[PDB]
């Protein structure tokens, strides 16, 4: 059933890091502006656990300085209030996040010139972070998605090399394994899960921003290209709403995009469905 869930976009960057929280209703094409983040945030990730939206990591970059964030903040859509949570062990700009068993996993990202391979897990019930096994590769501008209680970390930049590699985290055994590499080097891609596939959309290959999109089928263990987006974009937001992928904003090599495109896997087609109220990159996005 369609029950009225919305796409939330938190933070982002346009001329400086932003504090916006806005919700898009794909059913009627409307945008609603919600309570601002207390502190502006770009390069963060969003997720939802237990009906709450979490904004994880990122950076505040403006004429008042450039500082990476270890923050975790929680937004309750029922109260339209943000609440601070326990911070992570380290700041993580251009972080990846995924949720397994009601816990938030934060992977990679950067703190100054440090490119993390470390990974930590947040338990909402105890408002506590705990370090788990590190990735095999340092990854900033990494994308993450979860399928059947496995977490995939895809692409990024290791401090020297921009990556086509990907790896999978097995939470019960607390270990990582490299999986098949992508066709394309991508940092700052949008990574999500839809059906049995992990998608990597857009990103930066070291030369250009990308409009290509590829997906990893966890059964056949292959990466296959699907239809490209209309707009090249890196530092895009991505999420899944009612069985379709939505990509929000990003940087195309010239402009900070307000474009939102929607992918239907049944027709293998992208369409532009709306525009954000202002163009931005580096947003955190989730659905509830």
């Amino acid at each position: 059933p369609k029950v009225g869930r919305l796409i939330y976009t938190a933070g982002g960057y346009f001329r400086q890091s932003l504090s916006y929280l806005e919700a898009y209703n794909p059913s009627n094409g409307t945008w609603l502006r919600l309570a601002d983040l207390q502190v502006p945030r770009s390069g963060l990730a969003g997720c939802v656990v237990g009906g709450l939206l979490y904004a994880v990591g990122g950076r505040n970059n403006s004429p008042d300085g450039n500082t990476d964030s270890s923050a975790l903040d929680c937004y309750n859509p029922m109260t339209n209030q943000w609440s601070p949570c326990a911070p992570m062990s380290v700041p993580r700009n251009r972080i990846g996040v995924g949720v397994i068993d009601g816990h938030i996993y934060a992977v990679g990202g950067s703190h100054g010139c440090i490119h993390h391979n470390s990974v930590e897990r947040y338990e909402p019930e105890r408002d506590e972070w705990h370090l788990v096994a590190p990735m095999l590769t340092r990854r900033i501008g990494v994308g993450v998605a979860v399928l059947n209680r496995l977490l995939y970390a895809v692409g990024g930049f290791d401090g020297t090399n921009r990556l086509n590699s990907a790896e999978c985290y097995y939470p019960e055994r607390n270990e990582w394994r490299m999986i098949t590499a992508m066709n394309t080097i991508r940092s700052g891609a949008g990574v999500c899960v839809l059906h049995n596939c992990i998608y990597a959309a857009g990103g930066y290959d070291g030369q250009d921003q990308l409009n290509s999109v590829e997906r990893y089928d966890v059964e056949t263990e292959t990466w296959t290209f699907v239809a490209p987006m209309k707009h090249r974009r890196s530092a895009l937001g991505i999420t899944v709403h009612q069985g379709r992928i939505y990509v929000l904003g990003g940087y195309d090599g010239h402009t900070f995009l307000d474009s939102v495109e929607c992918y239907d896997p049944d027709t293998d087609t992208w369409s532009e469905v709306t525009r954000m109220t202002s163009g931005r990159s580096g947003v955190g996005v989730a659905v509830t």
Side-chain angles (χ1 to χ4, degrees), residues 143-178:
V144 169
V146 174
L147 178 56
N148 292 327
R149 304 174 62 246
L150 301 185
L151 183 151
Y152 298 84
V154 178
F157 178 70
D158 71 18
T160 301
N161 313 293
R162 211 161 298 278
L163 307 170
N164 69 337
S165 68
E167 55 186 293
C168 182
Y169 180 64
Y170 297 84
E172 298 179 6
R173 196 158 278 254
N174 189 29
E175 68 180 4
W176 290 87
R177 295 290 187 271
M178 206 69 31

mmCIF file of all heavy atoms in Angstrom, residues 143-178:
data_model
loop_
_atom_site.group_PDB
_atom_site.id
_atom_site.type_symbol
_atom_site.label_atom_id
_atom_site.label_comp_id
_atom_site.label_asym_id
_atom_site.label_seq_id
_atom_site.Cartn_x
_atom_site.Cartn_y
_atom_site.Cartn_z
ATOM 1 N N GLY A 143 30.006 4.861 -1.082
ATOM 2 C CA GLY A 143 28.585 4.636 -0.984
ATOM 3 C C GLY A 143 28.320 3.294 -0.341
ATOM 4 O O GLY A 143 29.095 2.370 -0.511
ATOM 5 N N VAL A 144 27.218 3.179 0.373
ATOM 6 C CA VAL A 144 26.883 1.981 1.130
ATOM 7 C C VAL A 144 25.437 1.595 0.904
ATOM 8 O O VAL A 144 24.555 2.451 0.814
ATOM 9 C CB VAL A 144 27.093 2.213 2.643
ATOM 10 C CG1 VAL A 144 26.493 1.088 3.475
ATOM 11 C CG2 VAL A 144 28.560 2.348 2.918
ATOM 12 N N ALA A 145 25.190 0.299 0.826
ATOM 13 C CA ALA A 145 23.842 -0.217 0.879
ATOM 14 C C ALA A 145 23.822 -1.586 1.547
ATOM 15 O O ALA A 145 24.843 -2.245 1.633
ATOM 16 C CB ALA A 145 23.204 -0.243 -0.484
ATOM 17 N N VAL A 146 22.652 -1.978 2.025
ATOM 18 C CA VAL A 146 22.488 -3.207 2.780
ATOM 19 C C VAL A 146 21.461 -4.079 2.099
ATOM 20 O O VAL A 146 20.415 -3.587 1.676
ATOM 21 C CB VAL A 146 22.032 -2.898 4.229
ATOM 22 C CG1 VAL A 146 21.702 -4.173 4.994
ATOM 23 C CG2 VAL A 146 23.081 -2.102 4.982
ATOM 24 N N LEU A 147 21.772 -5.364 1.968
ATOM 25 C CA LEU A 147 20.828 -6.336 1.441
ATOM 26 C C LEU A 147 20.961 -7.619 2.234
ATOM 27 O O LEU A 147 22.059 -8.165 2.345
ATOM 28 C CB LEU A 147 21.108 -6.622 -0.032
ATOM 29 C CG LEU A 147 20.206 -7.665 -0.703
ATOM 30 C CD1 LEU A 147 18.721 -7.330 -0.595
ATOM 31 C CD2 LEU A 147 20.612 -7.851 -2.149
ATOM 32 N N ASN A 148 19.854 -8.052 2.830
ATOM 33 C CA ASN A 148 19.811 -9.295 3.594
ATOM 34 C C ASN A 148 20.916 -9.364 4.639
ATOM 35 O O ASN A 148 21.601 -10.373 4.804
ATOM 36 C CB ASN A 148 19.830 -10.479 2.656
ATOM 37 C CG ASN A 148 18.565 -10.567 1.864
ATOM 38 O OD1 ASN A 148 17.488 -10.209 2.363
ATOM 39 N ND2 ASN A 148 18.664 -11.048 0.663
ATOM 40 N N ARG A 149 21.016 -8.268 5.374
ATOM 41 C CA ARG A 149 21.870 -8.188 6.541
ATOM 42 C C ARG A 149 23.355 -8.251 6.198
ATOM 43 O O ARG A 149 24.171 -8.471 7.078
ATOM 44 C CB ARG A 149 21.473 -9.185 7.644
ATOM 45 C CG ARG A 149 20.024 -9.013 8.079
ATOM 46 C CD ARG A 149 19.529 -10.051 9.058
ATOM 47 N NE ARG A 149 20.286 -9.989 10.295
ATOM 48 C CZ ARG A 149 21.090 -10.930 10.763
ATOM 49 N NH1 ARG A 149 21.230 -12.088 10.144
ATOM 50 N NH2 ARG A 149 21.764 -10.688 11.875
ATOM 51 N N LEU A 150 23.691 -8.019 4.926
ATOM 52 C CA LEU A 150 25.066 -7.787 4.473
ATOM 53 C C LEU A 150 25.200 -6.343 4.042
ATOM 54 O O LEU A 150 24.299 -5.795 3.431
ATOM 55 C CB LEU A 150 25.455 -8.678 3.295
ATOM 56 C CG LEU A 150 25.369 -10.178 3.544
ATOM 57 C CD1 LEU A 150 25.890 -10.951 2.350
ATOM 58 C CD2 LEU A 150 26.104 -10.607 4.797
ATOM 59 N N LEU A 151 26.324 -5.722 4.358
ATOM 60 C CA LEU A 151 26.559 -4.323 4.040
ATOM 61 C C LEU A 151 27.652 -4.194 2.997
ATOM 62 O O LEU A 151 28.716 -4.796 3.122
ATOM 63 C CB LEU A 151 26.869 -3.577 5.320
ATOM 64 C CG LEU A 151 27.088 -2.067 5.227
ATOM 65 C CD1 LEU A 151 26.667 -1.387 6.555
ATOM 66 C CD2 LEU A 151 28.498 -1.737 4.846
ATOM 67 N N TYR A 152 27.363 -3.435 1.953
ATOM 68 C CA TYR A 152 28.278 -3.262 0.830
ATOM 69 C C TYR A 152 28.835 -1.850 0.830
ATOM 70 O O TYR A 152 28.073 -0.891 0.943
ATOM 71 C CB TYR A 152 27.552 -3.538 -0.498
ATOM 72 C CG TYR A 152 27.033 -4.950 -0.590
ATOM 73 C CD1 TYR A 152 25.821 -5.288 -0.037
ATOM 74 C CD2 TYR A 152 27.781 -5.946 -1.193
ATOM 75 C CE1 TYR A 152 25.359 -6.587 -0.077
ATOM 76 C CE2 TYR A 152 27.331 -7.249 -1.231
ATOM 77 C CZ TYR A 152 26.110 -7.564 -0.683
ATOM 78 O OH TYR A 152 25.657 -8.860 -0.729
ATOM 79 N N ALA A 153 30.155 -1.745 0.703
ATOM 80 C CA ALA A 153 30.831 -0.458 0.609
ATOM 81 C C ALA A 153 31.459 -0.394 -0.784
ATOM 82 O O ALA A 153 32.201 -1.298 -1.167
ATOM 83 C CB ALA A 153 31.871 -0.311 1.681
ATOM 84 N N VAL A 154 31.136 0.661 -1.529
ATOM 85 C CA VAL A 154 31.354 0.711 -2.970
ATOM 86 C C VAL A 154 32.104 1.969 -3.381
ATOM 87 O O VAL A 154 31.692 3.080 -3.052
ATOM 88 C CB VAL A 154 29.996 0.689 -3.710
ATOM 89 C CG1 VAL A 154 30.173 0.788 -5.190
ATOM 90 C CG2 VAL A 154 29.223 -0.594 -3.358
ATOM 91 N N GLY A 155 33.219 1.778 -4.088
ATOM 92 C CA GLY A 155 33.944 2.884 -4.664
ATOM 93 C C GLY A 155 34.609 3.772 -3.625
ATOM 94 O O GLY A 155 34.902 3.338 -2.500
ATOM 95 N N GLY A 156 34.865 5.017 -4.024
ATOM 96 C CA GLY A 156 35.491 6.008 -3.187
ATOM 97 C C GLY A 156 36.914 6.327 -3.610
ATOM 98 O O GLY A 156 37.331 6.100 -4.753
ATOM 99 N N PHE A 157 37.652 6.894 -2.671
ATOM 100 C CA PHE A 157 39.010 7.371 -2.890
ATOM 101 C C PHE A 157 39.791 6.983 -1.650
ATOM 102 O O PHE A 157 39.341 7.233 -0.539
ATOM 103 C CB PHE A 157 39.002 8.894 -3.094
ATOM 104 C CG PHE A 157 40.361 9.507 -3.290
ATOM 105 C CD1 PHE A 157 41.081 9.276 -4.451
ATOM 106 C CD2 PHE A 157 40.903 10.344 -2.337
ATOM 107 C CE1 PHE A 157 42.305 9.866 -4.662
ATOM 108 C CE2 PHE A 157 42.161 10.930 -2.544
ATOM 109 C CZ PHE A 157 42.852 10.670 -3.695
ATOM 110 N N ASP A 158 40.946 6.349 -1.828
ATOM 111 C CA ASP A 158 41.697 5.816 -0.692
ATOM 112 C C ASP A 158 42.804 6.733 -0.191
ATOM 113 O O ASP A 158 43.508 6.366 0.739
ATOM 114 C CB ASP A 158 42.236 4.403 -0.994
ATOM 115 C CG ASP A 158 43.368 4.376 -2.001
ATOM 116 O OD1 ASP A 158 43.984 5.429 -2.242
ATOM 117 O OD2 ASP A 158 43.649 3.263 -2.523
ATOM 118 N N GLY A 159 42.892 7.933 -0.755
ATOM 119 C CA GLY A 159 43.948 8.899 -0.422
ATOM 120 C C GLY A 159 44.921 9.063 -1.564
ATOM 121 O O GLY A 159 45.548 10.122 -1.702
ATOM 122 N N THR A 160 45.055 8.016 -2.370
ATOM 123 C CA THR A 160 45.962 8.008 -3.533
ATOM 124 C C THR A 160 45.218 7.588 -4.799
ATOM 125 O O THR A 160 45.336 8.219 -5.859
ATOM 126 C CB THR A 160 47.126 7.038 -3.285
ATOM 127 O OG1 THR A 160 47.840 7.446 -2.111
ATOM 128 C CG2 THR A 160 48.076 7.006 -4.460
ATOM 129 N N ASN A 161 44.427 6.527 -4.672
ATOM 130 C CA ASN A 161 43.753 5.910 -5.785
ATOM 131 C C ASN A 161 42.248 6.107 -5.673
ATOM 132 O O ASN A 161 41.655 5.924 -4.611
ATOM 133 C CB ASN A 161 44.013 4.402 -5.797
ATOM 134 C CG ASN A 161 45.470 4.045 -5.600
ATOM 135 O OD1 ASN A 161 46.304 4.332 -6.453
ATOM 136 N ND2 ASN A 161 45.781 3.390 -4.480
ATOM 137 N N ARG A 162 41.641 6.446 -6.791
ATOM 138 C CA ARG A 162 40.193 6.468 -6.924
ATOM 139 C C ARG A 162 39.748 5.058 -7.354
ATOM 140 O O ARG A 162 40.416 4.394 -8.142
ATOM 141 C CB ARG A 162 39.805 7.546 -7.927
ATOM 142 C CG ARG A 162 38.473 8.187 -7.658
ATOM 143 C CD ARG A 162 38.354 9.528 -8.386
ATOM 144 N NE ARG A 162 39.343 10.536 -7.982
ATOM 145 C CZ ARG A 162 39.252 11.320 -6.910
ATOM 146 N NH1 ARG A 162 38.210 11.277 -6.099
ATOM 147 N NH2 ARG A 162 40.218 12.181 -6.640
ATOM 148 N N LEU A 163 38.633 4.591 -6.790
ATOM 149 C CA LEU A 163 38.358 3.150 -6.704
ATOM 150 C C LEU A 163 37.202 2.683 -7.548
ATOM 151 O O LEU A 163 36.138 3.306 -7.538
ATOM 152 C CB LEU A 163 38.043 2.790 -5.248
ATOM 153 C CG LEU A 163 39.089 3.237 -4.230
ATOM 154 C CD1 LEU A 163 38.537 3.034 -2.822
ATOM 155 C CD2 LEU A 163 40.400 2.484 -4.430
ATOM 156 N N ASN A 164 37.399 1.553 -8.223
ATOM 157 C CA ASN A 164 36.296 0.763 -8.773
ATOM 158 C C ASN A 164 35.959 -0.434 -7.892
ATOM 159 O O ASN A 164 35.034 -1.160 -8.188
ATOM 160 C CB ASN A 164 36.564 0.295 -10.211
ATOM 161 C CG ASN A 164 37.652 -0.721 -10.311
ATOM 162 O OD1 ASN A 164 38.510 -0.828 -9.454
ATOM 163 N ND2 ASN A 164 37.630 -1.479 -11.390
ATOM 164 N N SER A 165 36.677 -0.605 -6.789
ATOM 165 C CA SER A 165 36.504 -1.785 -5.946
ATOM 166 C C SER A 165 35.294 -1.648 -5.025
ATOM 167 O O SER A 165 34.763 -0.544 -4.808
ATOM 168 C CB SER A 165 37.751 -2.004 -5.100
ATOM 169 O OG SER A 165 37.891 -0.968 -4.145
ATOM 170 N N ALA A 166 34.889 -2.782 -4.484
ATOM 171 C CA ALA A 166 33.788 -2.847 -3.542
ATOM 172 C C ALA A 166 34.041 -4.005 -2.598
ATOM 173 O O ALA A 166 34.740 -4.985 -2.935
ATOM 174 C CB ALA A 166 32.468 -3.029 -4.278
ATOM 175 N N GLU A 167 33.436 -3.917 -1.422
ATOM 176 C CA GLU A 167 33.599 -4.950 -0.412
ATOM 177 C C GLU A 167 32.337 -5.112 0.405
ATOM 178 O O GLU A 167 31.495 -4.238 0.440
ATOM 179 C CB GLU A 167 34.834 -4.683 0.453
ATOM 180 C CG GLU A 167 34.886 -3.315 1.126
ATOM 181 C CD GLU A 167 36.217 -3.118 1.828
ATOM 182 O OE1 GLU A 167 36.462 -3.845 2.818
ATOM 183 O OE2 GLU A 167 37.032 -2.279 1.356
ATOM 184 N N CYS A 168 32.223 -6.267 1.039
ATOM 185 C CA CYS A 168 31.028 -6.699 1.744
ATOM 186 C C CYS A 168 31.368 -7.049 3.196
ATOM 187 O O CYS A 168 32.357 -7.720 3.458
ATOM 188 C CB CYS A 168 30.434 -7.938 1.047
ATOM 189 S SG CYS A 168 28.920 -8.547 1.757
ATOM 190 N N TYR A 169 30.531 -6.565 4.113
ATOM 191 C CA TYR A 169 30.651 -6.771 5.543
ATOM 192 C C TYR A 169 29.620 -7.790 6.014
ATOM 193 O O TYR A 169 28.425 -7.651 5.735
ATOM 194 C CB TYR A 169 30.408 -5.465 6.280
ATOM 195 C CG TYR A 169 30.517 -5.575 7.775
ATOM 196 C CD1 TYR A 169 31.719 -5.905 8.385
ATOM 197 C CD2 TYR A 169 29.424 -5.318 8.587
ATOM 198 C CE1 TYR A 169 31.815 -5.985 9.774
ATOM 199 C CE2 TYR A 169 29.517 -5.391 9.954
ATOM 200 C CZ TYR A 169 30.703 -5.719 10.549
ATOM 201 O OH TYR A 169 30.771 -5.790 11.940
ATOM 202 N N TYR A 170 30.125 -8.778 6.749
ATOM 203 C CA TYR A 170 29.382 -9.890 7.311
ATOM 204 C C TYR A 170 29.297 -9.623 8.812
ATOM 205 O O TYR A 170 30.275 -9.818 9.524
ATOM 206 C CB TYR A 170 30.151 -11.184 7.022
ATOM 207 C CG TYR A 170 30.263 -11.450 5.552
ATOM 208 C CD1 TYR A 170 31.276 -10.863 4.796
ATOM 209 C CD2 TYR A 170 29.338 -12.223 4.892
ATOM 210 C CE1 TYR A 170 31.354 -11.035 3.431
ATOM 211 C CE2 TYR A 170 29.405 -12.410 3.511
ATOM 212 C CZ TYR A 170 30.433 -11.819 2.787
ATOM 213 O OH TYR A 170 30.518 -11.995 1.420
ATOM 214 N N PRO A 171 28.158 -9.085 9.284
ATOM 215 C CA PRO A 171 28.127 -8.540 10.644
ATOM 216 C C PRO A 171 28.241 -9.573 11.746
ATOM 217 O O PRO A 171 28.788 -9.257 12.803
ATOM 218 C CB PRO A 171 26.781 -7.824 10.704
ATOM 219 C CG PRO A 171 25.928 -8.512 9.679
ATOM 220 C CD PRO A 171 26.891 -8.854 8.574
ATOM 221 N N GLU A 172 27.718 -10.777 11.555
ATOM 222 C CA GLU A 172 27.775 -11.763 12.624
ATOM 223 C C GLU A 172 29.191 -12.235 12.850
ATOM 224 O O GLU A 172 29.621 -12.397 13.998
ATOM 225 C CB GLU A 172 26.827 -12.938 12.374
ATOM 226 C CG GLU A 172 25.361 -12.504 12.315
ATOM 227 C CD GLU A 172 24.413 -13.641 12.039
ATOM 228 O OE1 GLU A 172 24.832 -14.808 11.991
ATOM 229 O OE2 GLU A 172 23.210 -13.393 11.853
ATOM 230 N N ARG A 173 29.939 -12.407 11.773
ATOM 231 C CA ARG A 173 31.325 -12.817 11.917
ATOM 232 C C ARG A 173 32.260 -11.613 12.074
ATOM 233 O O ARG A 173 33.400 -11.774 12.483
ATOM 234 C CB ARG A 173 31.752 -13.698 10.749
ATOM 235 C CG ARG A 173 33.035 -14.464 10.994
ATOM 236 C CD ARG A 173 33.127 -15.684 10.085
ATOM 237 N NE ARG A 173 32.373 -16.824 10.604
ATOM 238 C CZ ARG A 173 32.913 -17.908 11.156
ATOM 239 N NH1 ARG A 173 34.227 -18.030 11.277
ATOM 240 N NH2 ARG A 173 32.127 -18.881 11.597
ATOM 241 N N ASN A 174 31.773 -10.417 11.774
ATOM 242 C CA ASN A 174 32.544 -9.189 11.891
ATOM 243 C C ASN A 174 33.781 -9.213 11.010
ATOM 244 O O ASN A 174 34.905 -9.116 11.492
ATOM 245 C CB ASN A 174 32.861 -8.885 13.357
ATOM 246 C CG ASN A 174 33.470 -7.509 13.557
ATOM 247 O OD1 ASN A 174 33.207 -6.570 12.793
ATOM 248 N ND2 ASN A 174 34.304 -7.384 14.573
ATOM 249 N N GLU A 175 33.543 -9.346 9.710
ATOM 250 C CA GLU A 175 34.635 -9.425 8.730
ATOM 251 C C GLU A 175 34.186 -8.850 7.400
ATOM 252 O O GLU A 175 32.990 -8.809 7.097
ATOM 253 C CB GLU A 175 35.126 -10.867 8.531
ATOM 254 C CG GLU A 175 34.126 -11.741 7.868
ATOM 255 C CD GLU A 175 34.582 -13.176 7.654
ATOM 256 O OE1 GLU A 175 35.681 -13.559 8.091
ATOM 257 O OE2 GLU A 175 33.807 -13.928 7.035
ATOM 258 N N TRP A 176 35.162 -8.406 6.629
ATOM 259 C CA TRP A 176 34.969 -7.856 5.291
ATOM 260 C C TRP A 176 35.617 -8.745 4.238
ATOM 261 O O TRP A 176 36.664 -9.357 4.482
ATOM 262 C CB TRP A 176 35.604 -6.471 5.204
ATOM 263 C CG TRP A 176 34.912 -5.398 5.990
ATOM 264 C CD1 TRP A 176 35.119 -5.069 7.307
ATOM 265 C CD2 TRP A 176 33.930 -4.481 5.498
ATOM 266 N NE1 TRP A 176 34.314 -4.005 7.653
ATOM 267 C CE2 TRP A 176 33.571 -3.634 6.563
ATOM 268 C CE3 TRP A 176 33.311 -4.303 4.265
ATOM 269 C CZ2 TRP A 176 32.626 -2.618 6.414
ATOM 270 C CZ3 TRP A 176 32.386 -3.288 4.127
ATOM 271 C CH2 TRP A 176 32.065 -2.458 5.194
ATOM 272 N N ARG A 177 35.003 -8.788 3.064
ATOM 273 C CA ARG A 177 35.555 -9.476 1.895
ATOM 274 C C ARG A 177 35.404 -8.605 0.664
ATOM 275 O O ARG A 177 34.353 -8.038 0.447
ATOM 276 C CB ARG A 177 34.797 -10.778 1.621
ATOM 277 C CG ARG A 177 34.928 -11.826 2.709
ATOM 278 C CD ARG A 177 36.328 -12.386 2.741
ATOM 279 N NE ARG A 177 36.459 -13.510 3.665
ATOM 280 C CZ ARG A 177 36.766 -13.414 4.956
ATOM 281 N NH1 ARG A 177 36.971 -12.233 5.528
ATOM 282 N NH2 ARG A 177 36.870 -14.521 5.684
ATOM 283 N N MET A 178 36.441 -8.554 -0.168
ATOM 284 C CA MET A 178 36.329 -7.866 -1.445
ATOM 285 C C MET A 178 35.355 -8.636 -2.333
ATOM 286 O O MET A 178 35.348 -9.861 -2.311
ATOM 287 C CB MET A 178 37.694 -7.755 -2.135
ATOM 288 C CG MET A 178 37.825 -6.581 -3.115
ATOM 289 S SD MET A 178 37.845 -4.848 -2.270
ATOM 290 C CE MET A 178 38.630 -5.407 -0.743
#
